[PDB]
Symmetry: D2
Subunit: 495 residues, 4 copies
């Protein structure tokens, strides 16, 4: 079809890279059944990188059948669990050995500064190595009462899971969906993001070396509304895992519900940053900045609502504004930058639209709002203020580099304000007074609370939203609760 | 309205009973806002007992607002948990003290033989006393890594839950819905069954003595399709708990899903009884009988599929048939009976319809199928056989006193047969060979497996369905997992 | 023998009390086999209260044999654990109903102000009710690997335990030794303190009502060096529980070790109070005072080492001294007092001896050291200062109302000082800076750390010493670990 | 001293091996301070292998000081625990890569057939890899009550542990003592067995590659009564771990007790094998044989008490005797052998002495008792029978290839017999009846029970003795409980 399984790619920073194509089923790279293809575009070159075979419903079905066999033939299940664990551990090491290209690849796929993409690579590796350690720790329970009966409970894997990957931090999105599944004996039919698919497929070449038997991991990519329904509406799949926009979330929920499937979801949201008169402003400023510009602002918990205690208001804003002048924005393959590119023009247009809405509803613009020149998806960062609590700009999700700063008069009041919304994912607190910190942390309702820090992740700590914003958890030991179900056996003994 | 808050009821076995009416909100008995009423009928007299005020949407809304205040004013939450526990414990004792009438009341409400209704009263009491013990045991977790950070996780109550009660075993249905909620700090708006509402309201008179503050428990009754939607579609309710028919289950799921609510469900199902040549037939026969006639057959796990190993087939059926001749059926207030009445003519007609279908599709009738005379909802118990695996009668749910017996040739084959269905709630095994018992129990897929016993319940043991048949668990410690969610806090320490 | 089983006692505050005598074996009150007796003396009257039969080795042996039967006949063990739990719960209620006399009795036994004895009664009741809740929560574990094996672990009670009661807080000492035993199925041969034996026996009259079968609880009293060896050196007893002086602790350890017994111990110790410039002095002063005068100073963790940050030194001491002038000392049956009497002249002489040593080695006396008049065991409270770290007075245990205050220059230094000793039971911190509190708490080594509070107990929180000072824990769920051992069973399945 | 740090060793099966000498302190190989040496002898050649420097008290002290620094400088402790884990994992792989020599070395050290030494190498590797997985799973607990307080508990490493290695299975003895320590942050001063020291030192060469910082692992060897006291009586060591003979156990307990140290111990013991008429004799015979001849009989749980149900007695003994004729005994470096050599002439003489006692007290000898020729420590295996329950031979520990077979009449009686002793380490059951197996397993008291299997180990399953025979556990997750202690912190919040 004039599309060889691999294509040589030249990377801008001196690297030779061979990029695979096709779908990955039963550990083989294959062309799509209908012979369709689509073009992959570089976000800060505005140019073609390569062509990838496009999957369709026909291939989705094959992947499902493969996953079934992998589970039902017992090769992944009827084992000494320690072996399930060892294979994952090795895979993690194989990845570590190729770090230089992997970081470069991600940078190419999404514009994330190379200076930080490296961080995620290290994080994902530690995550995988750790989670492998649970393979032989998933215990059942003995219920012992009386002298005539025996009772036990045992945990079992649910079956085939369908999973959807977004495009914010592809490496982590990958690991958080696959490792919790594999470790308990589940198999996966995974949908890769269409806009940034390359790194996800590349790393699959190591699966056969790690020794994961064919059929356990199946990777399919193609356009979302097509592939998505092909997976979520199939009768075989038992569980559905999705992250994204609220409206989509509801829609998926209605369809999945029809089959009585188990469904987990994570939506985006908004979060407060409460700054008290006790904290050193110099430190608070650096933390607030990180929290709103990191990864081009395309972050699920990069809250924009900043509340500053009145007595320090004047200085927080004086310094914050001036500090922003130094945020170097530019080439993703330049270790000196901080801000990179946006994923595509879609999001770019959306962001700019809201900037204009803000100006018309009556928000005061302090800085930015301009496109950063004519080429590449870049936006000059903004600050808004003197925004009344009823403004649309403080209810809506921007998912970009826009921050709004308002006033704070009393602790009880800030708590009440912080809690008045449907999007309970995270919150941050800046102070030194032990009483205040404990009080606020235990009264503000959010998935997670960060004290004198922000965007600080660790593999042992769970993450997910409190009410409307979501159902289930992405990380740590508790994450495993949603991949398992409990069976119970009771027996009567005559004597 | 000519409906006093209480009415004297004379019970047939020498008891004086005062029956309350009205709705129970903020610990008060009140008349319904629209002044509507409906009549309560005696299942084996075919006669009127009393009139109850009928609730409507207007009252449902009030109950919701009450529940909200109970939660948000902190009186139930900001406490030393041990006190939450103590109040529940006392309530259980107050109930124990009135056992004689309570058993009589249930008998009046549903036709269950008095000889067994007593059992459930004792079971529910032990259940409640035990679960009270978790009030101060619901611990969080400390995550300790590095020397610069602190991490903890804490469990929090979800909020207001809506709950629906069926009509099979009202006392237990009550306890399994309320106690897991109360123990963690949740409040409840509960819908009582319309056909058998009396015992559920009577026992509420003790709530004010136990000391549960007003607003925590709200009891509303009225017609299902009205009240039901009034609760499930309200924006305040966070969780929905429902049990019932498969079709209804799906419907509720679609509506609840629209609000991204947390939804748990239990459907009915079917179950096998696998009888091996190793077991003593005399014992197997008594266990099989219990499993199909207990509580008039209106039992969620009273499986009708009986598989008998070929070498003993002739004797199992000879004895089983003859044994059934002794199952005394009659007056619910007669300690000598075994079988009581059916809930209503609706179910009666349904059962008889299927008996006729069986005869026409080609099933062989061994015994029964007749109505047991002209008065009261009674059915003469049946046995079918020589039924091919494709028959409608072995796919459908009867939910009544109908059993089908077939042949078994080989253990691998019975396992494969047992698993071929969507309704995975329970299974039973009858044998003496340790190898066989362990093999089958770990290969037949079901919510729960009973060895050499049947319908044997204990408060420490969990219960619920494996795949299609349900989501979540009704009893024991693991039940609490679905009433709680986890929050996490991470903090950075400078030094 | 002219000693009736009961004697009328008149209590000074209008109460009629009947006091039992004899030993309590198999739920019966019996006279001692050798017909010996001893006199009980009132600590602040200096006068005889009553005579109690004195036990001997002969009776100790009977108690042991009784305990054996209680265990081995299965009546306490082969049950639905929930029943073990219920009996304990009731016993706790029976005690609650008689609170007025119980508080008065303790006051009579040890001089503790009535104003605080009431507190311990409430605490012990909550403790017992809570721990009863574990009767049916002590679970085993299912180990599930491979497809050919089965593995489980189950916890079992150790057997007959011997226990020793000290004389500081008899009600709690009682509960902390008995309830953890009973809840798991162990039986106990308990030695009651000889100097303050009355309340311990009185409450035993309720055991037969609660429904604890005879032989489970056996109460014997008599002189320590006799009865003690009679228990610790017997071949039947499996576990030994002791609290007391360091030297005694070692001695018991050497004897118990000879039989390979399981031995737990708690010794007294010393603790620092670190006061920072950040804390409000008014609050710090009240907490420091409580911590050194509560319960006449006869408290295992009433640390005397006070470290005050230099910048506030002058005011801490000015206020502290003046504040002490208000500590009313007097009649135990006067709600207005704070300080009561010492247990006996033995301890009184010991305390005074050390005061004199202090004066001679060179400590500066600020106040007190005088006997508080000629009648009753009362001591005027003291304060010392300008005491060099090498002084004997800051190495030795006083176990009385003596406090020493020194200087603090730097946080690292105070941590290093705090940790330089063998007696690691507790520590306290007074501040408002979250960083400091977290740092110190995680660097000072002690059994337990209290922040901005002192002597603040709760049934859910564990307690015991870090290194030399002890082995094992007195309270909360973890306490149960030392009353149980684990059995494991593994089985191979052919198919 | 004419002793180079390494010596070339030629192995009989074609291998070139370089053997190190000296002590291993701070990751260096050093000569002993007093320049003493001793000779290593080959058990089935009766000949010199090499000379090893002999350690003394002076070196023991250095090792202790090194361990202290390793702990107190924080390099092993103040880390992200995941790194502690990774280093151990790598070490395990380095060992796996050198399996061929390691198995050969052990064979040289103790005469164990090469055909089975390989098994232990594989077992130890899996064990180490698994336990590494707990590095970041050792969690603390959050206690959450009220609204004014905070409570947490955290686990901390005890400190420097002293450990003693026996000579039965050196590879496992090594791993079971070191890995549970390292994983929690403890450091170790280890005493290597004097009679079989070589493999233990060889493997230490990989510690520096794994990356374990110097001072964490210190290996010292020399004569037992000297080195032993040097460690157990030192004031720095906090914990003592010992396995061995009962008398020694008691002695160590008395000394360690003097310092209030934490002491764990495992003694040998005896165990029953209960054979029922239901089991296939062919299988029972093979399992009984393994259980008494494996590893030359020098096994802690190789029980010799065989009880055979009367109805099958004649055939069990006919077959068992004949079967023993095939147990090939010979050269350790011959894959076809089953039985190898005894450790030394000491044990050889002891065994033979008991054979003679048996003959004189009146036991009937069925077979063996002869020395297997004049060269090498070999014994021809024996069988005794018609031995009355009072015979010394059935009370004493042989720790060699001697089995006694008696009669069994009734299940209750065998249970009562099985339990009549102080040495409760293990028991085995042979049957097919589920009721019998469950009954006996839950009535016979032993550390562990094996059903239709024997000597079947797995890393996830715990092991240790029930009463007299020991205190503590060697394997699995529960083993970690004795290397940690709990600290608790409570804090009061003003608001
Ligand atoms: N797994 C088991 O059941 C097991 C294991 C080992 C021994 N044993 C028993 O040992 C019996 C005879 O062997 P044995 O007399 O040589 O055993 P032992 O003296 O009890 O052996 C104990 C081990 O620890 C060392 N040791 C002994 N006493 C010590 C002390 N006071 N201080 C420090 N270290 C000390 C010894 O090292 P050195 O003697 O080499 O100096 C020896 O290897 C056998 O019959 C067997 O019952 C059983």
């Amino acid at each position: 079809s004039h599309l060889p399984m691999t294509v040589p790619i030249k990377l801008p920073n001196g690297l030779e890279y061979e990029q695979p194509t096709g779908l990955f089923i039963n550990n083989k790279f294959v062309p799509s059944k209908q012979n369709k293809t689509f073009e992959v575009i570089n976000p800060s070159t505005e140019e073609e990188i390569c062509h990838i075979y496009e999957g369709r419903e026909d291939d989705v079905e094959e992947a499902v059948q493969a996953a079934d066999r992998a589970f039902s033939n017992g090769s992944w299940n009827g084992i000494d669990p320690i072996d399930r664990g060892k294979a994952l551990y090795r895979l993690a090491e194989l990845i570590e050995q190729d770090k230089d290209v992997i970081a470069s690849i991600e940078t190419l796929d999404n514009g994330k500064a190379i200076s930080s993409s490296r961080g995620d690579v290290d994080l994902v590796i530690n995550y995988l190595k750790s989670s492998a350690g649970f393979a032989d720790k998933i215990d059942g329970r003995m219920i012992d009462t009386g002298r005539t009966h025996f009772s036990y409970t045992k945990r079992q894997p649910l079956g085939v899971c369908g999973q959807i990957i977004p495009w914010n931090f592809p490496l982590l999105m990958w690991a958080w969906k696959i490792a919790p599944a594999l470790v308990t004996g589940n198999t996966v039919v995974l949908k890769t993001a269409e806009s940034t698919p390359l790194s996800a497929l590349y790393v699959s070449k190591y699966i056969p070396q790690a020794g994961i038997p064919p059929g356990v991991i199946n990777i399919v990519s193609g356009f979302g509304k097509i592939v998505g329904e092909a997976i979520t509406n199939h009768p075989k799949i038992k569980k559905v895992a999705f992250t994204g926009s609220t409206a989509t979330g509801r829609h998926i929920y209605q369809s999945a519900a029809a089959g009585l499937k188990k469904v987990t979801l994570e939506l985006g949201g908004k979060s407060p940053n409460i700054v008290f008169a006790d904290a050193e402003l110099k430190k608070a400023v650096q933390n607030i900045i990180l929290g709103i510009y990191y990864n081009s602002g395309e972050v699920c918990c990069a809250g924009s609502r900043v509340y500053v205690e009145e007595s320090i208001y004047d200085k927080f804003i004086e310094e914050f504004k001036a500090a922003s002048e130094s945020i170097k924005v530019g080439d993703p393959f330049d270790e000196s930058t901080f801000q990179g590119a946006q994923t595509s023009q879609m999001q770019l247009n959306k962001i700019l639209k809201y900037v204009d809405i803000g100006k018309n509803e009556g928000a005061t613009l302090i800085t930015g709002g301009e496109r950063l020149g004519s080429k590449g998806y870049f936006i000059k960062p903004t600050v808004f203020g003197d925004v009344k609590e009823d403004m649309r700009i403080v209810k809506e999700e921007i998912f970009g580099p826009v921050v709004t700063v308002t006033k704070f008069k009393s602790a009880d009041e800030v708590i009440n304000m912080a809690n008045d919304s449907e999007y309970g994912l995270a919150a941050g607190i800046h102070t030194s007074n032990i009483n205040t910190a404990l009080k606020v942390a235990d009264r503000v309702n959010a998935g997670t609370v960060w004290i004198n820090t922000y965007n600080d992740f660790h593999h042992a700590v769970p993450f997910g939203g409190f009410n409307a914003s979501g159902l289930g958890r992405e990380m740590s030991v508790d994450a495993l609760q949603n991949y398992l179900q409990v069976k119970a056996v009771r027996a009567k003994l005559d004597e």
